[PDB]
From Swiss-Prot, chains A, H:
Gene name linked to the record: SPOP
Signal peptide: none
Domain MATH: 2-132
Residues shown, of full length: 30 to 164 of 374
Sorted UniProt keywords: Cytoplasm, Host-virus interaction, Intellectual disability, Nucleus, Ubl conjugation pathway
One Gene Ontology term of the molecular function aspect: molecular function inhibitor activity
Superkingdom to which the source organism belongs: Eukaryota
Name of the featured protein: Speckle-type POZ protein
Length: 135, 160, 160, 23, 160, 23, 160, 135
């Protein structure tokens, strides 16, 4: 049950909004069972002031038939060349409930992302690759 | 970057206005501080219901400014409620390249009759000096570029 | 060299009148303190209903200015309620160059029968001395130019 | 030597204005 | 008492929703950190599309709120692009009086599926202590008041 | 004793929402 | 007072507009720095060609005015090129009388879309506290009295 | 040839302009010869910078049959009661030509005029009384 998701945000420097806002994604699934719907809820700004200067990336289970879903999610960012970079993996099998989000608040420094020498923001477009394994 | 069974493409639509605004015989500004030389309204082809103008005070707008040029941008007509935009002003030089370019980092909100600008735009003595040549033949040329951000749209394409 | 989708142009209209006023046998000033020698009214073709005149006091306007010849510009006829102008007085020496040319930094507001000029214009002793050459053949050749400013108009261009 | 569009030759007898005008 | 020829009245309309949410058998919260107990969606009869709900975490969001019961307000359904509201959460005691009432001074911008609330709403040990009386019969009663602000209109009643 | 317009009685067995809204 | 043979009664015509503005639930001003809440256009019966409006920023205009209410007067339309007027703003109390009334001694030139007002009109904490009674029932009533001066006219009556 | 002139300005506090301008009167004369025309010129603020806080007042000869005219002028202010107060004259017989202004720049302090206790500005109306005698 290895889901995958390559979601792209263009003209990202025009982030359009202030502190603590969300950029919701399209609900994605696999062909089977197609009854489990997930969406990446990214915040281009920090989610909290406790750890600001961060691209807090979350995974939310929007639709589910069962009471709970045990899933391991892994986010990553593609560079200009396109390999997997900043691959951050959640080690536990997190429990998911109807309308529940888990993810990495301290995902990546915004200052680290904003340098052009890193190549992590090519053509003002960022590509998030998320893999979800359901057990 | 492996193959994704599903992908998305969020498009935060942006539109760009480009404006040149020329004042001849600028030394004959003819009035004291607080005066405003309004500019003719300008827009793009789309949506063309949004009308912007440049408001410039040849002298300082505030008591702290005095010897300062202040350049503002005003939205005179809006079909929506509010419009968020980033504006960048730059005084063109005698040869023609952009000098003294100062931009607003935040996407400022805009309503009808609401203006945003830089009171501390350029030193007035810097502007009036002949050596740097920001006022060639008593002409002041301001180039203003406005980027208006729109709502995001997701196309939601699912792969094999 | 940026390219602007919309361009504007604001032109502030300035009209320049010039006047060369010579007074023969000036040393016979014929009167003491308080004398005003008026000049014949002058104007250009446009708009030809703005009539100005020059008014000089050869001795001086007031007791601070006994040794200071004072020259004044008087707007005798004007159609509008308010006229704004900037004046420059000068004196032509024996050769013909301008000498002691002093200008107005501000654009003063003029009205019917209002005078704005430099009371502290020129030393009397500097004028009468022959080695200075400012009084050739006893003829004081004053020379004035006034730039009157009008309200600006926006051309309001647009390109595509 | 600057030029003007209007003249005024005020002559004081030993005061009238000739007021010649350049055209 | 000054009589004015012209009057005006700018009325900003506030819509107030109120919510009483009781959770019986609270001590058997059945889950550790991270658990969210959603409430049934509630609304008032003002266009009946602004549906709100309350999300409580009986343990807390994170390690800074281990002993802090968080309580969030979530706007599930809304007609407009954004809604501006100010919310107040309180707890009822055995006598029914409000206790531990706290509110957000700002008017927060709400959107489709956005939660604005107090992570450090109440001490856990304060709540479970029986002498405090905040948990009568293992039932946690929460009171919520939401005031939605909308765009104002002008009446402008001209006076004789 | 404050009064509310909408109620919700969540019961946990030994979790369903009654939502006894005031009519 | 002996009887003069000739007299001249000069009338500098002045007109007076009075304005009362009421804002209900003012604490729900709903926006931060820079927000302008305009007022309905007001005028007198004669000549009814001069159209003004009030404008207030609840938080303030500039960094000097964080804790300062700012009230401004704006001439939204006028057929003449310029209008000179003196404006006086005041805030009524709970009992209804004037409080913290402060006025402008100088008459400012007004033009199409020009504002003149007091950025530091009243301290925000002074207004927001309950003891002074300056915000009764969350209502802020502003009384604006403006006086427009006109050109003088001489009747020139002659006696025996 | 003793003229007289009661030249009144109402709502004077709404003085309509800043320092350095003139409120011109209408031309006046006597029945005989009715050819010599005079007019007062009063500057509500100071005429010149050192005057500033001053109410300068002048007499101007607009129309004259002869070349040069000798005249003694005396200005005064009529108070709330109506008597002649702050009356000071020009002892010298001043000489007048076509469009010549003679008078007092230092005629009265603006601040001394502006007290309500003095009564020199009743009902925002000021009453200049000018008496000029031609010899």
């Amino acid at each position: 049950v290895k889901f995958s998701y390559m979601w792209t945000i263009n003209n990202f420097s025009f982030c359009r909004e202030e502190m603590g806002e969300v950029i919701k994604s399209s609900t994605f699934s696999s062909g089977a069972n197609d009854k489990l719907k997930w969406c990446l809820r990214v915040n281009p700004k920090g989610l909290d002031e406790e750890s600001k200067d961060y691209l807090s990336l979350y995974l939310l289970l929007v639709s589910c038939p069962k009471s709970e879903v045990r899933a391991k999610f892994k986010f990553s960012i593609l560079n200009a060349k396109g390999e997997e970079t900043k691959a951050m993996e959640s080690q536990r099998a997190y429990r998911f409930v109807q309308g529940k989000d888990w993810g990495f608040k301290k995902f990546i420094r915004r200052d680290f992302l904003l340098d052009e020498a890193n190549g992590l923001l090519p053509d003002d477009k960022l590509t998030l690759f998320c893999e979800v394994s359901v057990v």
